[PDB]
Amino acid sequence: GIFGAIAGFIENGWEGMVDGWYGFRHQNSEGIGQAADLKSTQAAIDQINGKLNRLIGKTNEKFHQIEKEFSEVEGRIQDLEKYVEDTKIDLWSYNAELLVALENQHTIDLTDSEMNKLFEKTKKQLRENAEDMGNGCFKIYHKCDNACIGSIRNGTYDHDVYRDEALNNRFQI
Amino acid sequence: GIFGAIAGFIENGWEGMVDGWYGFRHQNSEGIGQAADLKSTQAAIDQINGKLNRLIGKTNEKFHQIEKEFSEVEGRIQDLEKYVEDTKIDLWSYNAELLVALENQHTIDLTDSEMNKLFEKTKKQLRENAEDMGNGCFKIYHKCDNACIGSIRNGTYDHDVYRDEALNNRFQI
Amino acid sequence: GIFGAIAGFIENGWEGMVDGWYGFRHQNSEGIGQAADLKSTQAAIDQINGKLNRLIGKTNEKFHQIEKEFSEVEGRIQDLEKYVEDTKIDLWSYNAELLVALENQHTIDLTDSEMNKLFEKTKKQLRENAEDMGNGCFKIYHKCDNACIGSIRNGTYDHDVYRDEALNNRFQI
Amino acid sequence: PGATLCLGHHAVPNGTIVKTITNDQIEVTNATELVQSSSTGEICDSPHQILDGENCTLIDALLGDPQCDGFQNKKWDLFVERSKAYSNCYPYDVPDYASLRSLVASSGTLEFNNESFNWTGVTQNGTSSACIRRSNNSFFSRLNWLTHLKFKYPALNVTMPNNEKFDKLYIWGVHHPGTDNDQIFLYAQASGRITVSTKRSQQTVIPNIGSRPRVRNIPSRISIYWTIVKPGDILLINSTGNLIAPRGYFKIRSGKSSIMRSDAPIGKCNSECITPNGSIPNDKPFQNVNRITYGACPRYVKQNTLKLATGMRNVPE
Amino acid sequence: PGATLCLGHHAVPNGTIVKTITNDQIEVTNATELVQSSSTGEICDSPHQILDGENCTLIDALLGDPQCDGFQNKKWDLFVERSKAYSNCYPYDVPDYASLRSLVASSGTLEFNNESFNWTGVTQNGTSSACIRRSNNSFFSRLNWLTHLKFKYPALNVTMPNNEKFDKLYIWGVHHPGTDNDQIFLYAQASGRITVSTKRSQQTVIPNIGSRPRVRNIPSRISIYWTIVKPGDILLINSTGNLIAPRGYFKIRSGKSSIMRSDAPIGKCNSECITPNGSIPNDKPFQNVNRITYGACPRYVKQNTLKLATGMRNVPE
Amino acid sequence: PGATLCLGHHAVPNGTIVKTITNDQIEVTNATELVQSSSTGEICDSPHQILDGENCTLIDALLGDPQCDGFQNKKWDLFVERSKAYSNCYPYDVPDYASLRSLVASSGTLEFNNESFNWTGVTQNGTSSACIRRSNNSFFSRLNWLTHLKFKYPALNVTMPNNEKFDKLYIWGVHHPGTDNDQIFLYAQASGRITVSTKRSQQTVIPNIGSRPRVRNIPSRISIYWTIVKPGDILLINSTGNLIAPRGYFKIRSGKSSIMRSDAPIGKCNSECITPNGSIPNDKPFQNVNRITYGACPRYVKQNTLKLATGMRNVPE
Numbered sequence A, B, C: 001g002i003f004g005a006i007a008g009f010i011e012n013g014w015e016g017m018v019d020g021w022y023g024f025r026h027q028n029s030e031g032i033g034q035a036a037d038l039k040s041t042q043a044a045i046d047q048i049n050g051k052l053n054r055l056i057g058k059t060n061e062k063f064h065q066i067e068k069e070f071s072e073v074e075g076r077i078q079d080l081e082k083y084v085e086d087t088k089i090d091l092w093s094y095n096a097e098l099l100v101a102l103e104n105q106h107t108i109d110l111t112d113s114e115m116n117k118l119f120e121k122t123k124k125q126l127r128e129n130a131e132d133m134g135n136g137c138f139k140i141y142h143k144c145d146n147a148c149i150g151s152i153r154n155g156t157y158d159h160d161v162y163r164d165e166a167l168n169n170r171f172q173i
Numbered sequence D, E, F: 001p002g003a004t005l006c007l008g009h010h011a012v013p014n015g016t017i018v019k020t021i022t023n024d025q026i027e028v029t030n031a032t033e034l035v036q037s038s039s040t041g042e043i044c045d046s047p048h049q050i051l052d053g054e055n056c057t058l059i060d061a062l063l064g065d066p067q068c069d070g071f072q073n074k075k076w077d078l079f080v081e082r083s084k085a086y087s088n089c090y091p092y093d094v095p096d097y098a099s100l101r102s103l104v105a106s107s108g109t110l111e112f113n114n115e116s117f118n119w120t121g122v123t124q125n126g127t128s129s130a131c132i133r134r135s136n137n138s139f140f141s142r143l144n145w146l147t148h149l150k151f152k153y154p155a156l157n158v159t160m161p162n163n164e165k166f167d168k169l170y171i172w173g174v175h176h177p178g179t180d181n182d183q184i185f186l187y188a189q190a191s192g193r194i195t196v197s198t199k200r201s202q203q204t205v206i207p208n209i210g211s212r213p214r215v216r217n218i219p220s221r222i223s224i225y226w227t228i229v230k231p232g233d234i235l236l237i238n239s240t241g242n243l244i245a246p247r248g249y250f251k252i253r254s255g256k257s258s259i260m261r262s263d264a265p266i267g268k269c270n271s272e273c274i275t276p277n278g279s280i281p282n283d284k285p286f287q288n289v290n291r292i293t294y295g296a297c298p299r300y301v302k303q304n305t306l307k308l309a310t311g312m313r314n315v316p317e
């Protein structure tokens, strides 16, 4: 949320995008289409897998410890045993609570960041040939068929090819 | 600070804005005015209230514990009682210190983020009708009376209405 | 990494920049040059020094404690002494691990942020006289000699001086 | 001409300094304190059941020192022990005093039930001038000083079954006389050995005759012991002298009760968190008033202030 | 005409709620649970060496109660003590029972080596009807009840050197007879005093004659003591009666062994983490099954669920 | 033609790998180590007052073993006990040795004040060949071995008031002779019972005659006890034999003193943090040298390295 794309200027997610986490929808002369972006998807997944690698399957071996349940009343020594354990448990419980809250804030922010980065990259690529409509969509001011849209998604779009056409369309009356 | 608006490209805050945390000042044909933006203000407040809800009025009940002050010298058992408590206190003191440092860094960053998000939204809304002066201000290249400024603040500004006028003003010699 | 400049749209760092952390390279009529930006460099350094001031030279004095090594088998009291210490050490070890992971994530992000902020500032300064090439570089559409490049780096560049020349070059056929 | 539209944020003339990860002093528009550092100085009587010990320690109230008769059968959430408390009965010690104090404090009750022990052959209800109750010589109310009957003290072998559904706490003692004369005068024979047993425990104690420094003019001592008897178990007391006998048992409960040392006055007010310095508000997560607490309390920390930012960076005009 | 190109992100119809720093309920596309909250209910026999105590406590297995003969010389990583366990030999107590239990549990072995003590002058191998082994009167297998020989019990002054490279654990006892008659019948003289010593330690114990409440019809008791003898040190036993003698020593090891109280069945399965409720998977970092654990286990926390986001915010159509 | 203006950042040819939240290995331009993992191997004599025990344990220095006479009245911040230390006086034990060692270590002083005890009727200043001081038979310097005078040992009932403003620490002992012959030869009567008392405490100890394994050819033992006497209280010693008497008291202080076991040499150097491995620098927040520390020390952690990034991500050409 801190970058402002997911749950921000992107109105909502796409339930029909099932082969990636981020991607592109377009409308042109040949129809309306959708394609996932693999690099942004993998960037987010890699980071989340990084967190998981640091939390899952990493336990600590302990063996003989202290007693933690007692059948008889004893006073001072048992009071101390119980307090040591209660102290420990509360500290670990705090660590767990904080860990999850911080990690989740960070996951939401890093995924928002990857959406924003893909948007910014696409904006720069289009140069003077498109305008940002404010909702994650670009109005492209030239004929842009399926191969042209593909060139944008693959990073091979040559803005100079279309610039005269686009400027004429943008800056008319 | 990490977004670069508050204490960054926005030179300073406005002591005269008392009905919101973020907002707009303008100059046009009809004068100079100020208006708070409620949605950004509430977004920041909501997040801060979220932190407070997790810290305030959430205490932990404890009853019989161990002794923590001693009138006589005893040696081994008392050394252990004192060490358990000193250990506990230092761990909690660390938790408190870190909690406040992290939360405060995050509060400063999230409030900066809300300022940046409002600026970006406004930039996109204005399309080709304005230019960013670098200091959080836009030069709007068309006559923009009080109702027009109001339309910008309320998200009802139709850039197409003014685009011919604006382009003519921007791209002259 | 969360801002997208360092290890993102900036392809790589400059091993030949040894007098600052961030800066400018240019090509113009008079050659190719490099200059460090001191303000962004100092902003990053100050933040990192802030972290160091909170971690280095800040130790805690402890005196008489409990025994932690034992020459004879004793049972209950020794089990408790050992458990208290093992508990303490594991909690501190966790704190240390988390502290370093979080601080390092934050350092990478804050340094990325300072790069992005300098890029954004420069973009705004250039107004309609340049275009972002997508890789941290601007194509400047007017003759821009060494003094002109210097004016950009020093914040004294007057975009109005060059705007007619630049617009003519940008928006030709 | 056109227009100018500026985006901005508020600022205040009276900002507050907070700590962050990268700066120990940054000004924000507002902050809130997370460390409770003050008390009014009174222990609120509500909502916890408070028992002010006044002149009595818990153990003196247990045994039944004559200043503590008002405490009989009382319960508490928190027993408050005052530094001015002092004993005014026969001088005694409790091996493992701290443990008896703790277990009674935690039980939270002085509920006592008299039982009919069969003390045939001895004189009961011994008293002393060191333990005055209403100008008369007296003794601890919950203990029974047994002496010779017609210069005989026959061997005692006395039983008390626990046919209740709960555990019983027995408090008893051994008398250590100051001299061999005293031993004879009281018990009519040389000092022996006391054995108190159950099916699962045994305690034997040897009376040790001798002068100790006088306390309220008494050079002898009583040593206090305790025994818990579980349901369907049986208390057995075996003595030939020197026995300070129980009169019955205390109920032993479990729950949230405790004990605190404090000289703070008790007030008519309502507070969930008690410290020895008085009750404290518990809105904040941390406190630096006292490491000793009872109830729903903020956690003790060493810092006297921790300010949580509740507003943006303050960047004044 | 031109084209439109929209950037976006996925969403799911079945999102999950997680907690963050600023919101206690935000929906994300996916999450994973970090708290293990269930067990199958069985303690897996692998990969730790499990020893089910069945009817025997560890201390009964140590001493050699006749129901525990199958335990001789066995080792364990985890000794499992069942709540149904009960003693069926001569009634005994162990001052500092908890410590003996702990040190044997931690050693992880009941390996026992017989030694030839020189008990000239007394009758060995005393037995009792309170300790039946195969319908015959018997006694603890690791202890040697010494009584008079021809109404004589001469003073014992018996030595056993440790010329091994490891420490020896000796278990021994003092018999407290129910009556003066029993004392005479068994030891032919008045009760004395037992002293067990080494170069670096000494323990003396006084037999205390008297009736205790009968346990399996026995009013006498044995009190159990232990002594560790280091290499090149020497055990010395000095007695004139009431000695329940060692038959040899236990090896004392160090390592990863322990003991747990549990009524969970032992299963043929493989799990690294044991709790009293059964084994639990250890993929997750935390667990709320039991504070009592053995092996590679998640850390105990109070929360029953902690969901880690593994996807972005879910923003449905 | 125009110009090109590129924004960028530095990189280095020799980056360093650090851990982050999302990646266990990312290269940054620079980092700093947060775990101190080395010592020079010497304990710096400054700025803490170090007392090297050399051949003496603290308790041997306290009692006054003849190798420890140089220690009289010395103070310390840290007493360093060496593994080579050994006793060379009369063989003794201290029930609760660990506690006496701890309380003296924490007090930080061996300051001793002689007092004039009234030992009329016995022979003072007993010596032994097991405790040689300058080729002569001797004894612990702070203890007074009392024996018969003209085959009489009258009952001792000896007082010492504390009219000081501070607490007094008394160290005393009970002699356990090897045989009944020795008992008679030394004390002229059968072993009795020693009672040391104050207004608020009492300790009675029973001498136990018997052979223990010989230590430096001695089969008898002394058991050491201690008593703290508060201002306006009174020490009372009651004995008919076997008393190893105090010669006076130790001052008991409170402060920052302690004790450490180490074989590290003491160096002429200045370091605030001491471990058994030697002093360590304390610039870093953490250390993995030793869990045992004294002074202003980094906190012990299990990690041997924790690298804090001090530069951006390194993205080489």
Ligand SMILES: *[C@@H]1O[C@H](CO)[C@@H](O[C@@H]2O[C@H](CO)[C@@H](O[C@@H]3O[C@H](CO[C@H]4O[C@H](CO)[C@@H](O)[C@H](O)[C@@H]4O)[C@@H](O)[C@H](O[C@H]4O[C@H](CO)[C@@H](O)[C@H](O)[C@@H]4O)[C@@H]3O)[C@H](O)[C@H]2NC(C)=O)[C@H](O)[C@H]1NC(C)=O
Binding pocket: B052, B056, B057, D030, D031, D032, D283, D310
């Ligand atoms: C600086 O930032 C802080 C934190 O955000 C702001 O402090 C909050 O201010 C609000 C508005 O005054 C407070 O709201 C009020 O809370 C009362 C509870 O007070 C006690 O209880 C809490 C915990 O239970 C303690 O933290 C607190 O210190 C008090 O001891 C309510 O009783 C109030 O009710 C009133 O208004 C409601 C409106 O519906 C009505 O029902 C009633 O009529 C009643 O009069 C009210 O809700 C809030 O408690 C403050 N929080 C904290 C943590 O202090 C500052 O306002 C802000 N300063 C500036 C200048 O912006």
Ligand SMILES: *[C@@H]1O[C@H](CO)[C@@H](O[C@@H]2O[C@H](CO)[C@@H](O[C@@H]3O[C@H](CO[C@H]4O[C@H](CO)[C@@H](O)[C@H](O)[C@@H]4O)[C@@H](O)[C@H](O[C@H]4O[C@H](CO)[C@@H](O)[C@H](O)[C@@H]4O)[C@@H]3O)[C@H](O)[C@H]2NC(C)=O)[C@H](O)[C@H]1NC(C)=O
Binding pocket: A052, A056, A057, E030, E031, E032, E283, E310
């Ligand atoms: C929601 O988010 C979570 C977390 O990212 C995803 O859960 C992961 O899903 C993957 C794919 O199913 C899992 O990968 C598989 O892991 C198995 C190990 O299972 C156990 O062990 C781990 C710890 O050791 C436990 O955390 C876990 O709960 C299990 O008890 C492997 O055995 C699997 O191997 C299979 O595929 C590989 C491919 O090479 C082959 O070798 C084999 O043929 C085999 O069939 C596999 O690797 C991963 O364990 C899950 N992680 C967690 C933490 O649960 C969810 O998929 C995701 N949901 C959605 C809808 O996106």
Ligand SMILES: *[C@@H]1O[C@H](CO)[C@@H](O[C@@H]2O[C@H](CO)[C@@H](O[C@@H]3O[C@H](CO[C@H]4O[C@H](CO)[C@@H](O)[C@H](O)[C@@H]4O)[C@@H](O)[C@H](O[C@H]4O[C@H](CO)[C@@H](O)[C@H](O)[C@@H]4O)[C@@H]3O)[C@H](O)[C@H]2NC(C)=O)[C@H](O)[C@H]1NC(C)=O
Binding pocket: C052, C056, C057, F030, F031, F032, F283, F310
């Ligand atoms: C990689 O990143 C690290 C951390 O930012 C940099 O390390 C710092 O480098 C500076 C410059 O060399 C160091 O500054 C010097 O500190 C000395 C103190 O040294 C000891 O004390 C501290 C703690 O008290 C320990 O952390 C440290 O390890 C030492 O044991 C001062 O004495 C120095 O003074 C000198 O310069 C000053 C300038 O005014 C003069 O007064 C004197 O003449 C004197 O000669 C100096 O201040 C700093 O200590 C380093 N910090 C750490 C944590 O190590 C690396 O430089 C950096 N590497 C690269 C390649 O950029």
Ligand SMILES: *[C@@H]1O[C@H](CO)[C@@H](O[C@@H]2O[C@H](CO)[C@@H](O[C@@H]3O[C@H](CO)[C@@H](O)[C@H](O)[C@@H]3O)[C@H](O)[C@H]2NC(C)=O)[C@H](O)[C@H]1NC(C)=O
Binding pocket: D179, D211, D212, D213, D214, D219, F157, F158, F159, F234
């Ligand atoms: C062993 O020695 C102690 C200490 O010397 C003896 O105790 C003391 O006994 C005397 C009397 O013999 C006590 O004197 C009394 O003092 C009170 C104080 O007001 C006074 O009212 C009486 O008239 C009398 O003078 C003295 O208090 C007491 N001291 C202490 C410290 O207890 C003890 O009697 C000796 N024991 C034996 C068996 O001899």
Ligand SMILES: *[C@@H]1O[C@H](CO)[C@@H](O[C@@H]2O[C@H](CO)[C@@H](O[C@@H]3O[C@H](CO)[C@@H](O)[C@H](O)[C@@H]3O)[C@H](O)[C@H]2NC(C)=O)[C@H](O)[C@H]1NC(C)=O
Binding pocket: D157, D158, D159, D234, E179, E211, E212, E213, E214, E219
């Ligand atoms: C001291 O008092 C106790 C308790 O009164 C005495 O113990 C009791 O002794 C009687 C016999 O004298 C025991 O009775 C027996 O009960 C069994 C139960 O089935 C029965 O089989 C026998 O025929 C006999 O009746 C009784 O159990 C026992 N009670 C307890 C609690 O142990 C003890 O003997 C007295 N000691 C002395 C030295 O007098």
Ligand SMILES: *[C@@H]1O[C@H](CO)[C@@H](O[C@@H]2O[C@H](CO)[C@@H](O[C@@H]3O[C@H](CO)[C@@H](O)[C@H](O)[C@@H]3O)[C@H](O)[C@H]2NC(C)=O)[C@H](O)[C@H]1NC(C)=O
Binding pocket: E157, E158, E159, E234, F179, F211, F212, F213, F214, F219
């Ligand atoms: C109880 O038994 C112990 C052990 O058997 C007896 O102690 C031993 O007593 C003998 C002499 O009777 C000691 O022998 C001496 O050895 C030294 C060593 O160099 C030598 O210099 C002497 O000439 C003599 O041979 C032996 O050391 C000692 N053993 C131990 C382990 O202390 C003890 O005397 C017996 N007690 C009674 C009351 O009989």
Ligand SMILES: *[C@@H]1O[C@H](CO)[C@@H](O[C@@H]2O[C@H](CO)[C@@H](O)[C@H](O)[C@H]2NC(C)=O)[C@H](O)[C@H]1NC(C)=O
Binding pocket: B069, D037, D038, D039, D276, D277, D288, D289, D290
């Ligand atoms: C609450 O009571 C404790 C009483 O111990 C106060 O802490 C003591 O403060 C004095 C100085 O005023 C020190 O000399 C003591 O060493 C402190 N004692 C302990 C045990 O730390 C504390 O200041 C009181 N707090 C408030 C807010 O009244």
Ligand SMILES: *[C@@H]1O[C@H](CO)[C@@H](O[C@@H]2O[C@H](CO)[C@@H](O)[C@H](O)[C@H]2NC(C)=O)[C@H](O)[C@H]1NC(C)=O
Binding pocket: A069, E037, E038, E039, E276, E277, E288, E289, E290
């Ligand atoms: C594992 O076993 C423990 C047994 O103690 C369970 O915790 C007890 O739960 C009952 C209610 O079912 C409470 O009355 C007890 O007070 C609890 N005991 C303790 C010591 O906390 C626990 O629920 C079991 N967990 C699972 C997952 O089976």
Ligand SMILES: *[C@@H]1O[C@H](CO)[C@@H](O[C@@H]2O[C@H](CO)[C@@H](O)[C@H](O)[C@H]2NC(C)=O)[C@H](O)[C@H]1NC(C)=O
Binding pocket: C069, F037, F038, F039, F276, F277, F288, F289, F290
């Ligand atoms: C400091 O001293 C301790 C001495 O205990 C060292 O830790 C021991 O290391 C050896 C291996 O060298 C192990 O066998 C022991 O089990 C360790 N002992 C304990 C108690 O953990 C430690 O390595 C030394 N550190 C340095 C930096 O010299």
Ligand SMILES: CC(=O)N[C@H]1[C@H]([C@H](O)[C@H](O)CO)O[C@@](O)(C(=O)O)C[C@@H]1O
Binding pocket: D126, D127, D128, D129, D130, D137, D145, D147, D177, D178, D182, D220
């Ligand atoms: C039961 C009994 O008769 N107790 C008597 C005691 C004891 O003899 C001593 O206190 C024990 O040492 O002494 C008195 O002088 C007293 O204290 O009043 C008379 C009192 O009646």
Ligand SMILES: CC(=O)N[C@H]1[C@H]([C@H](O)[C@H](O)CO)O[C@@](O)(C(=O)O)C[C@@H]1O
Binding pocket: E126, E127, E128, E129, E130, E137, E145, E147, E177, E178, E182, E220
């Ligand atoms: C060694 C020996 O002879 N023990 C005898 C014991 C003991 O006298 C008492 O159990 C001790 O109090 O008593 C018996 O009746 C019994 O228990 O079978 C006979 C048994 O032979």
Ligand SMILES: CC(=O)N[C@H]1[C@H]([C@H](O)[C@H](O)CO)O[C@@](O)(C(=O)O)C[C@@H]1O
Binding pocket: F126, F127, F128, F129, F130, F137, F145, F147, F177, F178, F182, F220
């Ligand atoms: C005060 C005294 O006379 N002590 C004597 C001791 C003791 O009799 C035994 O050590 C106690 O068991 O024995 C000696 O042979 C000795 O050790 O030198 C002679 C010495 O003078």
Ligand SMILES: *[C@@H]1O[C@H](CO)[C@@H](O)[C@H](O)[C@H]1NC(C)=O
Binding pocket: A146, A147, A148, A149, A150, A151, A154, A156
């Ligand atoms: C874009 O990349 C895909 C590979 O997934 C390829 O199939 C497609 O033909 C490419 N299109 C263009 C126009 O480059």
Ligand SMILES: *[C@@H]1O[C@H](CO)[C@@H](O)[C@H](O)[C@H]1NC(C)=O
Binding pocket: B146, B147, B148, B149, B150, B151, B154, B156
């Ligand atoms: C903008 O919104 C406000 C509501 O606060 C309204 O009063 C105002 O008339 C609106 N103006 C325009 C031009 O839409």
Ligand SMILES: *[C@@H]1O[C@H](CO)[C@@H](O)[C@H](O)[C@H]1NC(C)=O
Binding pocket: C146, C147, C148, C149, C150, C151, C154, C156
């Ligand atoms: C820019 O600033 C530098 C100061 O480092 C100065 O030397 C240079 O002449 C300036 N150039 C211009 C064109 O302003």
Ligand SMILES: *[C@@H]1O[C@H](CO)[C@@H](O)[C@H](O)[C@H]1NC(C)=O
Binding pocket: D012, D014, D015, D016, D029, D030, D031
């Ligand atoms: C600033 O002043 C106002 C009005 O006096 C007050 O309510 C507020 O708490 C103050 N804020 C700070 C941060 O001191």
